[PDB]
Design a protein around this ligand. Structure first.
Ligand SMILES: Nc1ncnc2c1ncn2[C@H]1C[C@H](O)[C@@H](COP(=O)(O)OP(=O)(O)OP(=O)(O)O)O1
Ligand SMILES: [Mn+2]
Ligand SMILES: [Mn+2]
Length: 295
């Protein structure tokens, strides 16, 4: 089990994605090899699991809590954090990560807060959701415009493909605000963009509320909500991965799922050390009165 963080994998040959012949064992080995990459995000954050016992061709179970875990190393958080429910979950090691895969996990989504203080978010996320029949170029132009606004606000943003159909923008924040304050700020940004360019942006959820447009989703900022982790796999055809990218290579992207679990190695080799999010952990910023004025 040297290639699976010492974890025994049952039914190693069952297919996670028949389209590319990706087995459960391959998925486990991927999480073992890149555990450190995924842990850059999961190590100190509560995590929600997307489990697919029958592969992407079957259904998916979105799990937040668990009473009994057959995942050696997984951490069960204090029920007091979410009364009326079994313990939340936290993965802090390669063994726990692979163990989760062994139990059917395919995707990992983390909270916008870390164990240091789960009542003060350390980031907010803007998830751009486009109309299914909208040209990819629209997503690129919308992402560029969103970053321009963030620059004016004086906020540093970190971009990543979702692995699905849109882009994700993560903005770290000092733990000085409560959940409602951060969410309202994120919503204010979405509404601001919708007011400036109603032809491009929408601040209201629901496909019927973004026909031919892009919805700047701010709902992922609710306490308990989560967002797919950078470098994590998506339970979709081709097993695409959510990949951090430089703002300078944005216009060169051709799709939110251009990278997959098998092409990631090449991505990392091409980068050869260059890290799109090299300045993440070191970023120190907070919501200021000036920002509210601009919004
Ligand atoms: N297996 C799938 N194949 C195609 N579309 C999917 C699949 N699963 C989910 N979707 C679509 C339907 C959902 O309304 C939408 C939101 O996915 P979600 O993971 O919640 O946000 P996301 O940002 O991480 O991915 P996306 O870029 O697609 O929005 O994606
Ligand atoms: Mn989305
Ligand atoms: Mn969304």
């Amino acid at each position: 089990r040297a290639a699976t963080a010492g974890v025994r994998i049952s039914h190693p040959q069952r297919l996670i994605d028949p389209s590319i012949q990706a087995s459960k064992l391959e998925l486990a080995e991927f999480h073992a090899r890149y555990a450190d990459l995924l842990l850059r995000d999961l190590r100190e954050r509560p995590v929600s699991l997307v489990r697919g016992p029958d592969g992407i061709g079957g259904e998916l179970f979105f799990q937040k809590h668990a009473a009994r875990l057959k995942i050696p190393g997984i951490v069960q958080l204090d029920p007091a954090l979410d009364p009326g429910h079994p313990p939340l979950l936290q993965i802090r090691s390669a063994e726990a990560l692979v163990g989760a895969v062994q139990m059917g996990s395919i995707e990992f989504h983390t909270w916008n807060a870390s164990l240091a203080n789960l009542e003060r978010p350390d980031r907010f996320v803007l998830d751009l959701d486009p109309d299914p029949a909208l040209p990819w170029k629209r997503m690129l132009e919308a992402t560029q415009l969103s970053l321009t606004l963030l620059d004016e606000l004086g906020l540093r943003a970190f971009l990543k493909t979702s692995g699905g159909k849109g882009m994700h923008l993560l903005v770290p924040l000092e733990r000085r605000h409560g959940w409602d304050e951060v969410k309202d700020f994120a919503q204010a940004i979405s509404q601001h963009l919708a007011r400036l360019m109603p032809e491009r942006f929408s601040a209201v959820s629901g496909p019927r509320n973004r026909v031919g447009k892009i919805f700047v989703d701010y709902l992922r900022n609710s306490r308990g909500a989560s967002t797919v982790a950078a470098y994590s796999v998506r339970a979709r055809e081709g097993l695409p991965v959510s990949v951090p990218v430089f703002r300078e290579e944005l216009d060169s992207l051709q799709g939110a799922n251009q990278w997959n679990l098998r092409s990631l190695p090449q991505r990392l080799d091409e980068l050869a050390g260059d890290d799109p999010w090299a300045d993440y952990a070191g970023t120190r910023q907070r919501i200021s009165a000036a920002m509210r004025r601009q919004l």
